[PDB]
Amino acid sequence: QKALPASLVPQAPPVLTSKDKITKRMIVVLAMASLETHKIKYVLLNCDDHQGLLKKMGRDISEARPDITHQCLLTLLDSPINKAGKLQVYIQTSRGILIEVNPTVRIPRTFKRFSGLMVQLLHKLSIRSVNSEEKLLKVIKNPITDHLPTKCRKVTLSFDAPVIRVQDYIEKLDDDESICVFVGAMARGKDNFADEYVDEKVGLSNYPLSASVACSKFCHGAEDAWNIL
Amino acid sequence: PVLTSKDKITKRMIVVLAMASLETHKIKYVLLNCDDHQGLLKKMGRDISEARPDITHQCLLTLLDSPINKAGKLQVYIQTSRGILIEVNPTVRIPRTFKRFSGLMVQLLHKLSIRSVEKLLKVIKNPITDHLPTKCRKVTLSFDAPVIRVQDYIEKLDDDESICVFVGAMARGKDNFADEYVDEKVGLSNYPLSASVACSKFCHGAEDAWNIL
């Protein structure tokens, strides 16, 4: 019963960026990422591939696993919400390095190549596209807050925190505001990495959740809540 | 209780990782990989594009780590592209580093099973149909197929029957690997989905539909 618009042709949604603070988006912060390089050539320190070297460094190799970050970013970036252009990923390395992930990027799915990207990114501080038009991965200055939208809700994943329905929270949250999630890619540790930034911590399920599963779990609720399909 | 192929009455979410690209080669037996073994596979003449087992690893990781599996309502099956069918005990916990997963698979394929002291990973005889529950609904993931809500879909189906989803871990190819067994094909998301993402999406609906939490 309604006349159709002037132009029905689907257009690619603008790619969200840190400069833009008005648009609603779902921010995910992969805190405590274990991404470190060392000359042997520079190689991403790995939990299994390198054991003696990290012992020489004195770092507990249990918290030396970047594959968790690789899978979490893989499950994130491939999510439909990215394909709808409503998500931005931020990575906070355990050392204190903050990395902005352009939604357009595509990490290699193979872990070995992923390590090659990380060492390239950490040393050059930036990654350029094949077509050479945009910097997909860029290291950015801390604190995280300045990059986040002016009006934004901050939350972390806490197993001890009350178990919630991710879908329900997103509808009752206001529209112009955005939601920022801090996810611990650590294999184990105390969930206080983002306490100083966050305002309230939530648990997603009664049972323990993997970081990749929780990241995938959270985005699905937003897509259901925002009708992203 | 831990769900098994012998028990058919119980409701469960069955996922079949069809066209799985797992293969062992000796120069000692090692799982073939797109990156680790290129010149060797070039000498085979097979394209390295279809030499990528990590999709099965990632998909099995997300499926195994999902709340539904922890709730004892999910069983995983893997149909290798060579024609090998593998049953995955829900109790298992695979290695998450890909290298240790590959060493497990070569152990699984050559010894035909894994025992750690029930059989964690066991190679089973084809076809899949005999193993699956007696009353069960079968679907595949097809991009061209109509988009359907996984929550609404599972709700509208009956309770005694079980659900099979046939997911293609394969890199490229026509979505006809499981046409013979399946009765209809459904679309999960409006956009193209990776196998792991679609598996992550589907178990979300079952968890919401069944109130697994």
Partner: peptide
């Protein structure tokens, strides 16, 4: 255009 589960090209 790459789609779904494609890996970036390796040279």
């Amino acid at each position: 255009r790459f789609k779904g589960d494609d890996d970036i090209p390796y040279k």
